[PDB]
């Protein structure tokens, strides 16, 4: 189908949801390129994904994606590499208000960055055959929280571009369809983020409503975040598209 | 009321909407900061507004929002010239797609950073008498545009910054009120941006839509979204709200 045979670039896969992601996609027959900050964690994640598929069908490049420049020959060294760039994913981020400058950095400015090179590659009119970029947000992309104001303001962000990017490529004739998940809670590191002051700063003394909260609705395993991801890449009639994935209803779609 | 005797600071007020905000504010009877990149227009604005009112309740100050010490040392110029800081108003922005990142920098993060230098010297814990922080938004933070994605992006991380801290401050037992506005067309000089492949860039060929948009929806005059403020300003119980003012319904209120 429109996978097999593909190639996928994937941001933050060296551990969790993109992990989880180049998984599902290698065991439906792709080419994935792995981009993380940290090396250690995605040489030792490309040498167990060498374990179950074979080497070639993966490959690993370190990157920070704020750097402009560093994702620009990441970009260039992946389809050099394989031959073109039909799919990708943008998925990195993190969790600090008390650093809320670089939070917005890395959560927005890097997502629109990476979405802006990808049609430079993926569009019919620079002489692609089209393709499908998906960008990560949160439910917090949708309701307010107390403890978490400029997380809260780039997921939002990320939302309202990619809603406007599925019009204008609709417009442009480009052949590239932009859609969105936003999921709940994961079972990943982020969460010990909330119970350390480094993270949350002078939001610290209200933790514990977001642990509550946590203890209400539940934490979802992260291999049921990408069968949402490969169910969004095989639908053709598919664009401008938020997904929401909850462990009370399942994968669902927000209504306009 | 809560506006005779009250010292209000506000950010793009040389021309447009900041201007009708301090003229209103003025005839209310307060004093007023203004700030603005742009000395010329600031200069002439002042000098009209001294022909109404007296010299000592005006006050213009040449700052870029963008650069943190720059605001960092007009806030301060500003307490120490008044005496309190009662009232912000963050209104500075902005269109330009071509250069996006500056867009983002000027509309989103200056808006935050202003927010918390002021939640440090109109907080009770920190010695302050609390006061009121309005920022201002668009419709585009609430619905898509084509032609408009990075600014769409930057409108609705405004309201989800605005609706998380108003939550935030009423914890923290700050005696502040945080709310938004997000105006229809309005008759100032960004429209004429709309004409210019320098503030465009490829989304040019796309501008008969909102020429036609424009012209459908009607114009709002600034005065009467300075009426908002007002409204905003004398009302004691109202915390993390939406304004929204068209030219067809009036101003209401979004609901959630
Ligand atoms: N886990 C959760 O509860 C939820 C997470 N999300 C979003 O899911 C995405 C993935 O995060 P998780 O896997 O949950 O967390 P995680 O912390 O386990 O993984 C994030 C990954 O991004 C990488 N990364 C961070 N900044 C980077 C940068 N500047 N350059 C390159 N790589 C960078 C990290 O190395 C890490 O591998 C994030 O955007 C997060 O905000 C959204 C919904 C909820
Ligand atoms: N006029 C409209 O149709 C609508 C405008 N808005 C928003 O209203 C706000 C006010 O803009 P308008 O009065 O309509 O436009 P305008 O262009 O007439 O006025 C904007 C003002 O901001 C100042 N400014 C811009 N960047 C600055 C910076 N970095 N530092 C300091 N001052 C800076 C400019 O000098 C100018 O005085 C903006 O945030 C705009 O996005 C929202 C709804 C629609
Ligand atoms: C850095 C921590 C990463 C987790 S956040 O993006 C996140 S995910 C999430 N999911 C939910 C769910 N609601 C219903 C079913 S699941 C709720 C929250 C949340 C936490 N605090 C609030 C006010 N909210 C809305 C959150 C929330 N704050
Ligand atoms: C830089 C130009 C500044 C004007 S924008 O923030 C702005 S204000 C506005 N107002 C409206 C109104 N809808 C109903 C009554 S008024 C519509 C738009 C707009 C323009 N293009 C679209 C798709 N939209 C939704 C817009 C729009 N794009």
């Given at each position: 189908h429109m996978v097999n045979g593909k190639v996928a670039l994937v941001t933050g896969?060296?551990?969790?949801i993109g992990r989880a992601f180049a998984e599902a996609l290698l065991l439906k027959g792709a080419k994935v390129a792995l981009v993380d900050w940290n090396l250690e964690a995605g040489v030792q994640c490309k040498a167990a994904l060498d374990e179950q598929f074979e080497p070639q069908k993966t490959l690993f490049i370190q990157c920070d994606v704020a750097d402009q420049q560093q994702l620009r020959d990441t970009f260039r060294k992946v389809v050099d590499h394989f031959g073109r760039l039909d799919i990708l994913v943008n998925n990195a981020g993190v969790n600090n208000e008390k650093n809320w400058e670089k939070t917005l950095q890395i959560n927005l400015v890097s997502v629109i960055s990476g979405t802006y090179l990808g049609l430079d590659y993926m569009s019919k009119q620079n002489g692609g055959e089209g393709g499908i970029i998906i960008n990560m947000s949160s439910l917090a992309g949708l309701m307010p929280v107390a403890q978490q104001p400029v997380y809260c303001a780039s997921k939002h962000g990320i939302v309202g571009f990619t809603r406007s990017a599925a019009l204008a490529a609709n417009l442009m004739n480009s052949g590239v369809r932009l859609n969105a998940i936003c999921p709940g809670?994961?079972?990943?590191?982020?969460?010990?983020?909330?119970?350390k002051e480094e993270n949350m700063?002078?939001?610290?003394?209200?933790?514990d409503h977001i642990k509550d909260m946590i203890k209400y609705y539940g934490i979802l395993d992260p291999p049921l975040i990408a069968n949402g991801l490969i169910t969004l890449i095989e639908?053709?009639?598919?664009?401008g598209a938020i997904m929401k994935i909850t462990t009370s209803k399942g994968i669902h779609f927000q209504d306009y």
């Open positions: 896969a060296a551990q969790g809670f994961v079972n990943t590191a982020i969460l010990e983020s909330i119970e700063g002078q939001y610290i003394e209200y933790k639908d053709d009639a598919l664009n």
